[model samples]
Target chain A: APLGPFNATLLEQLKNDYQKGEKEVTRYIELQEKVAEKYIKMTPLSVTAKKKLPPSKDPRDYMTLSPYWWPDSTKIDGLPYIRKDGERNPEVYEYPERENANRFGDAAYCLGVLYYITGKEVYAKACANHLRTWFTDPKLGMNPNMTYAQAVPGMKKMRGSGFIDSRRFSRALGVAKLIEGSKSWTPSDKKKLDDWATAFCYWMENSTQGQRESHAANNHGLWYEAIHLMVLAYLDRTDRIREVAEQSILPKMGAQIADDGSLPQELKRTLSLHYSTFALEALMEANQITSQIGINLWSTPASNGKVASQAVDYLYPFYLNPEDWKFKQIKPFDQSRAAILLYEAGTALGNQKYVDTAKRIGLKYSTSDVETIPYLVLK
Target chain B: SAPLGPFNATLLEQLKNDYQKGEKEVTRYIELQEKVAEKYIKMTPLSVTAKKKLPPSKDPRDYMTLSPYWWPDSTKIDGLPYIRKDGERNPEVYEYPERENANRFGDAAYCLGVLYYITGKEVYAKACANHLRTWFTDPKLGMNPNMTYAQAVPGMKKMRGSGFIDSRRFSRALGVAKLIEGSKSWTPSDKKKLDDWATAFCYWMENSTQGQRESHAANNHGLWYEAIHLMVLAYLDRTDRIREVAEQSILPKMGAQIADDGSLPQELKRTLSLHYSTFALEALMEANQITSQIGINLWSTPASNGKVASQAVDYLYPFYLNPEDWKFKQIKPFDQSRAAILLYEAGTALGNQKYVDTAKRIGLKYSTSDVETIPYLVLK
Candidate 1:
């Protein structure tokens, strides 16, 4: 299943490259056991299982609390939660395990990395057990739609913005691509997972909540492009992927990017540094998925003299000199994410400045739900 | 001469990343050295050539200094031996001699030399040479070869043999000489001046009553005297004396100096118990580096009393690991950086991973100075 945009050949080559280049194989080896052991012991969850309930919705539907909304201290029941910019309320993670969609998907990705890196059978088995219980189990499987996701306490049941919870769907399928070859992942299980992806994709495309998020015209739109393209790439549907890339994702960047390569949409936010970097981070995935079908969104020409290369160039100076950034960022600017972008983009564009800046500003990527170290490999 | 002296490429090239991401002892060492260079860059060493109170022995060139702990028994203008307040450093030492002698020579050049080791740039080495030349070579500015008048009390009739305690400046200064020895402008003449000056200084240290008096000192003063002796001779290629000291004099005396449980009775007996205890071990650890190159392992080799440096490491590591174990009240708090380098070298000598790991945990303490910057130039 760990064989989407990267086929078995590419995974092997990256593994080989790992041996002779930097010796992070141990970091890979030592940390994998820590993760795999958890997956090994974990009991998979579903929409309406033990300790699992979605508020104001059927047990089959997925749900999670809003990340930025907090309870009002002045009111008794804290009616209609207020929105705080940038700072996350801790109540978000208080949801029961695996009842949360992002939680389930994030685990799938971690289990997938351990399985793929080790090429072991047991991690794949543990992972597939997780997938089957969540996606394909006869009684426990989640409904294809997320009608009540991203609800806030004391507010109305669900907003059209609820579909944003599907952003990390790619991480789950990203691992499925890696483990496809493992004998433990049956063809029956693979088909079930594929069926779920198609149904989920259809919901995001046709449902009112999904369509509303699709047109939001900011990082959420970009994130949807990354998620669907990855899902389509994993399924056998390059036709849908190519059309989505050329028509939607590519056209959206044209309006959002300025002539100087700044993403004006992101820079307007309070966490401008994070939003700006997040947009590029998401687009790189879109570029990768687009590249699988022989399109080069990485090199797409911009009529206003801006492209992915210029976006990286704009961000480079900010990281090296944070004082030059005039935008408001209440949180400390995370340079690791910036470094992750420059390293991935620089290698793709074959640009040394971005690569050097990333190397100078940050350390290597650590344990996370993110796909990988050198997660992107150039042609 | 390497820009990275023993900075293993596999270890440091992708320095911050390759190791456990956020933690690397060598990276912290580099930042500390960088901070020192930045903080002290505008600082040019003040001149000893100024007209200060020259010692009673005539020449200001005689390189006189006062005891930091000794105070006027009630203002020495009243003519009395300076009384000791133990851990307190009198303000009078800062006025002239203290600034002139050790600060300009040891404190300044040591930082410049460490900067040169980290960068291997001629600018740092040249800055080092400029300081070195002033103190040891330039006739007008150079300190006299002998430290005969160091630790002079204002009311003493003449220079005190007790002044021999002040010679530890050369212990750190010798490293500066080593770092700049390869620079093109640290010319043969400059090398000869350092050599001749140290050779003369060594002769006086051997013959001077002060050197021998401090040699048998009851506390850490004796430890510094032996440390300086081995280091000076090692720098000047006096291998016979170096071998003699390491094989016989240093090892045999180590028993009396350090106990079987690694406690230094003379050191812990002081108010700054942790400091004096560490100060003595620091001397032995440095001498081990010199003797190491001579095909001798005086550091790990046990004396007749079964007292190895590792014994001292065991006794002291707990104090640094957790200062609450210290039974006596310390006048000053126990600083971890003071014991870090000794643990690193002793850990290496004994092949003890625990000591090295302990050193690394404490090594992240605010800053580690340039006092012993070379052996750990890139020591992991």
Candidate 2:
């Protein structure tokens, strides 16, 4: 067979695998509830609301914030204000608008998932309302321009990385998956929702803000393009999605990851472990998508394995046993999220070591009633 | 002479031509003085007195105090105070203890001398005399140390250049020179007045204030020391004694001006081409003084020849005559004095109109005194 046909065959097989995996997850959720009814009680608070809490003050917060959120605006004198334009402010309390938007988008993703499993119309409605308000509403919606969004008052007018927060819209792309076969959501409602989201995808693909964020050197830059491409795919903007994924996203990840699979810039940070885990999550997500699209996202094969697999294996030991992890500066909530996501990606990839590791780390953390709602529903 | 090769014969013929050129220059000094005097008579004054007597349009205190070069203790803001190395304002009335002691005595004396020289009025003379007495004579008022500790900033403490040479003592010596020469009210002790001050200053220059330590410097700092020493000795009318030292010590040391390929190292380092020329002229003028005093023809071949003259010409000619054609590898701000001095000196030595033409291009921006002083004999 020709390489293209062979790759196409492989991609078809992977899509089937994803469909099988989703079914297995659904079945797993049903089986867990049957076995442990008391433990599977869904809390009153929705997963979307729980995301509003500050990320854990531990090092894992680094991973959580890297994709989207930053700290709140730093005050100078009595003024409670953000820096003048779009930039990461060095001071405290000032969060970038895009980061907050990404957080909301991530929560929206969890809510979509919860609504799918529980058949809860309330969760779906809330997710739709937020999407409309954030992506489509005339006055209430965020402007397409990220020009003055993440500014550092005296230095920059706007930051390219502020656009990373729109990666939250990727969760909305996931919403497209969940709502595809739903009887409750009307065709007109779905069309309006798809059209609004596709407009955002258009902005991400064509606008200067989108281009700038896409070309950033860090993980934030990579995730920005990744999310942009993913959302574009869901909106049926396939040409742009493929273009961004192949040309921008994959190459940036390839260059930034060293031969040893280390991200030198991220590794040197105070949030090294958390940043490392978060970046791997992005890479894995991109890799999984590329695999399903018939593109081979290959890493240089090392003695341990391919660079991506090696990174996954290296992180597995730490995730399995957090006490062995040397990094002390992780935010609590973000650490838990990283463990959960890594576990999910690993399970989907059939990486048993990663699954066992995630379970060990997850069991040690005290479960807050507010934070446990989404996980319980997933179970 | 034995039969010579073609190159040797050409060299001998060139040597004969150069001798004729030297003789011609020797006879041209009288005409050179007249030309320099013509330029001096047409030059403008410094406008110092005109600036000082202008009416106060605003509240004197509210306006920036006139710098020390003007009135004493004038409290204005935008005035040009003397600049220290780091460009800090060294205000005239220093209240800080270290600063007060560091610059006040020298500044007071230097300002007084300038005031006396410009006005030639007795009020200016007496005011200068009072400051001189306070700094050097009165036991109660005199500064105890020979030199003040200057350059007292946090990081920058070392003396880097001649820019920091304290002119206060030189000013005091000049004050005494003016008193003996011009003032009729001077007593015998008043005549003996500056001699005693010079002797004391000479001791400090030699022993205590570390002027001797700096005299051994290989750079411009050493040249400044010799310049100041010559000035002090000249004012005391000990020119005959100092003339020999200037010839044997100063001139021979300066003759080591040849670098590996005979380029002038000192001139090349300066940012401004004209400033380097001016700096060389000042040193050459000091050397010129010894020749004039001793009745020795130092400007001729055997003593000092066209080497120094040629170097000055080579560096300056392209800039002066064909400035459009001149492409300075490193052009900086022009110093007008150096340009004028080069012109004046070239006109004296070569008797060439091209040199005169180059001098005229240097223009009126330079000091008249710097142009005239060396070109003519100071016959007072």
Candidate 3:
């Protein structure tokens, strides 16, 4: 069987390499340890930690400033913040809800990886504590819905795209699966986590915001599909996983990827290079979840001969030399995202060329970055 | 060849292309042409010699302007040394005609130079040529290359480093000389005279006591000094001094002036915090433009504390969107229009569309000035 979101077969290979004392494998292990060490000492995170309340006057209701929207300079009142695409408003830091969730997810994910590989209690204990505080505990646990997430100040109260905030919650769920075999993970803890995950999944499927997000034709829709399937797989809802693949995931690949293997919606963005790769990462996640069942989303073709692997092939050249990218990318491209994608796509398609490309790009990592789990494992 | 200073060739091509098509809707270019027409009529040739008042040296060639923020000390028997009141502007500074005269001369030359480029008219080119010669080369009427007595405090015996700031406008005039080098009206003889003057000015700025002190100011004064000095070097084709200053002086200044979060700490301390912060970045970005032309990348290179020029632009971007969000003390109403050129030029330099969009957001609706409108067409 699959190990939650990870490929069980690949995990076993990695574990065997570690046991055999492979040089690169040991280096990656040490890097994971370095990240986990910092995470262990850091303070735990909660949605209720922010002093300011959401529109609902609830601290438990997670809130964040829309990154691209800022105050209108033309108006004296400074009401109705305008949207500047690809421009980050520093006021987003003021809310800190998105940042808190990201830290919470990273800590749990990092600790879970260490515990899974080493079978160490310190890693499990810290990992379990993070899971319990974020999901299972009555006080620190976040409210199951992201109703008030990514709020732009002027026009609307809460937006549908704010559900993007809970994408980090999917990372926390990955931790739950990793630490499941631990002695520290009690049956009572599993039961409480299942209930919260089930409630959150229900909100994602049934809420108006969730429905709106599902209909989005861009990266937002792909992430919504990815998050929904990950939660469903965690809850053992095999039937809904197939339903999401048939309705949303498969249809997205058909529409989102073009005949020329370009992402039209993503290419229109100012940060085109980043967004195209970003959308592909989410689509690939959705593909992995559905693969555990009988669905092969990788080989399945959308209209105009578009497939999951073809999207990877289109970005392959630019991933190596981003300066050659003809599209507008205002900010510097984050190539690490491409490196991970290449690793996953290359291995899945059994293409040695793709894997070699991943290794080539992997050489660009700084010593500090090379130590991290994503670079080590994926590279 | 294209103008060597802050002009954008790609955007200038776009502007020229638009003009060729008989552009009507994008009226900023035409609006500029009309403004230049008015300037051609009224802009009599200005020089330091035209000023009725003389500096401490009593030399008409040497430029002088009062320190606008410093005033007479009431308690002193003779108001021997003017004490500083940070944001308070003393109108006595305007009494010095050299400051306003320099501004007019630079503006008229720049406008005429640009108009000649777009319209292919010898008239505009001839006007620009005459203005450059009268201000920079005419034996009797031309101002000296040095600004020894600029921004002088009334009661102070010796002039301070702040005086070099008055010559910041000289960059505009010199930029025009570069642009009109190919025109029939601007002969090789005219070019040689202007180049010699710039060479003299560059020498003084590098070696003089006041210039050395100005270069070490650690504020907007230092930033403008670096900008003007690098511009003169680029004009003179002096690469050695440009490289030395980029490494030794400008990098350390970036570290000291900009904070880790990209806020300008020194500028934020001023009463007109928003203006100075915006103004300092303008000078810094202009210096980056000149340095980058010589294979040095100052735009993205972070300081010891991780503060880069682009980060400072990012820090102030939100304030430009909504000035009221600025928490710092700003006595005057923060003019979004005055900042439009900075946004356009910085946006293009940093590859940021939002900055460009914000520049257009203000320029399209609010700003009617030549500074903002010209960049609207000339900046990509």
Candidate 4:
């Protein structure tokens, strides 16, 4: 009864691709190995080692200030700091939680996937240690709730926006599910990590802060539903997964994804293309998880009378021609981030043109490498 | 043109003159210096965000503290909700650091301001300025203006306005900020920043849900709310607000709260009736002093129900003179120091020498070495 956001059939295909020694697979493994090797002697990241403590002053509490909020110089103390949309405050880098937590998730995810493919004990053991350090160890593991995460200075302590920080949880947990029967990841190790996931999901359900993020109308909410549903599926909470899909995941898609395929909410952001693609990545990942639980969100008509595939096609041309995209993108548009979206949505929606377009973009953007994650596993 | 805070310039002038003459006043001045020196040794700034527990609002900028008297219900398996025991504080309440840290910040600011004024010590002013910056000015550490999440009871569904009282000492802290007005440590821009902070807080107190809830409280809570509100406004020099709050809130409240016998009927209902009665008067008397500065004389203004602040002080005067003669529920012996400051303020405002003499008696009743007794008599 093991389940996760990743497609089991696609993952099996990835294993076969590795065996076939596809040229793309060789490149992908080389890249992944280089990444995993860095983590081989990696000292596990814990919430306990940060120099700056959270408002709680507990070293174990994960905390990060909002990147977009800056102190208003007009005020006496620049108190209750004001929000400057799209501009990141360098002050956020001071908190190591967001960076370290992301690295922790990446380490577990890469190492776990490599272990699953290569059946290498070194990868498995390293991945499990990363899991234990970040999830199961009493002294090192993060507490279940993202209570003090993504605090805006002078505004509020924990933010609903903080939910985005936990997106990595699904990735790492999915990898844990993939390596379910590994010797390095013992049954005890599995239970403890699962228990952490259960507690974290319980917090997302019960805490007001969690509810705040769940109600976020933009990318933050979509990502929340994605992460929540993925974790629910990973835990085999099928009923809860279906409920979230129907109520939150589906409804949000309908409301957020316009009939023309453009995400109105994300289109207004400074990085419209990047955010639109970013949101699609989360939606497709959720779609992949929901399909495992017998809910097809990709094909289902959103409340807006548009399928998620329409949004995919809407942005497809822009991925091919970035300059034609008419939106406020202050930063250089990195089309590669959208490379996975093309493959996942193309294969799911049965559009060969979309899949072919993905291949073209992937050739330019290394994410399309046959040995990479979605490339090897998905289409 | 004088400082708009609580301290009368005349009193500071008199204290300065007395200190110059030498003897006991000079010793009192040295005592203040010693206090300021202790404060100088550790001028650590505090913020509401530093608490071990997250506030109910999930914002550390929001002020949060435990309802002191609430404890875990022993009968419930996991203590599903907390139960209240009046006057008995739960030790668990101390685990939340917002309230205690706020009081520490406020008192240090006040004491340091006083020392800087008397001794012209830049060190005291600097330390006081830093404390203010840490508590109110620093973008990273300063608290947000509202107390929406304050005094949250664990088992309770919503946070209470009782936590609004947590900022009562802040009024004095603001008052003392005026003492070091022109010091290099406290500049014009620095003063404006603090004023901006007070302006935001004043708006929150007037508009926030918790503010409205506490404002509507008909007992000592209501009085303290107005008292703290009026002082902050006074510090900000909003005479119009001082006048409006005086006529609109305090005037009607005195009538509804103070009985014909000059007793605070609402406070008399408490377990410690004498203490509560005087506690209620502290706010009324403080409000009276601030309102008097703005030409709204609350001490003498008779409410529609024929109750005035002067009557409230008179009713409490006998009890302060003789605690046993009090015919009310009193769990603890009355601390005369509580009545001492109120009597002095009431005496000065109402022109009743008897009240001022009683305050002197109360102040003299304690040791000169007892540093706490200084502010009650020295400020007066």
Of the true interface contacts, the fraction found in model 2 is 0.00
Off by over 4 Å in 4: A7-10, A20-31, A156-158, A363-372, A376-379, B1-380
What is the per-residue lDDT of model 3 for residues A1-379, given as tens digits with 9 covering 90 to 100? 3335655455656666777889877776765576467677777787888878887887777788878888774443456889878877766766756777877887887787677776778888898888888787788888888888878877754469988777776767855877786789989999999999999988998899988988889999999988988898888888999888887887887898887889999999988998999898887677667777867677776545668887888899898888799997866676766666787788778888888877777743223231135445444
lDDT of 4 by residue, A82-132 (tens): 776666665676677767777787777778777777677889888888888
Which 10-residue window in model 4 chain B sums to the lowest lDDT?
B365-374
Error of 1 at B137 (Å): 82
Chain A only, candidate 3, TM-score: 0.92
What residue runs in model 3 are displaced by over 4 Å at the alpha carbon?
A19-24, A303-305, A363-379, B1-221, B224-380
Per-candidate local distance difference test = 0.67, 0.45, 0.76, 0.75
Error of 2 at A236 (Å): 2.5
Model-by-model DockQ, in order: 0.00, 0.01, 0.01, 0.01
| 10 residues in a row with least lDDT, candidate 2 chain A | A1-10
Better of 3 and 4 by TM-score: 3
The DockQ-derived docking category for candidate 1 is incorrect
User: How much does each candidate deviate at the interface, measured as C-alpha RMSD after superposition?
Assistant: 30.7, 31.1, 21.7, 26.1
Residue B113 shift from truth in candidate 2, angstroms: 53
Model 4 chain A lDDT-worst window of ten: A363-372
**How many residue pairs clash (N, CA or C atoms closer than 3 angstroms) in each of the candidate models, in the order given?**
10, 30, 1, 5
What does candidate 1's lDDT look like per residue over A1-379, in tens digits?
2335333333555566555564555555555465446557767756564344665446667677777788663342456689886756655554542234555776676677667766678778877877887777777787777676777777864465656566555557656877787888989988888898888888878888778777768888888788778778778688988788777777777777777888898988878888988888778777766766677666775454446777777878897776578897745566666665776677678889877776676543334323443343320
True contacts kept of each: 0.00, 0.00, 0.00, 0.00
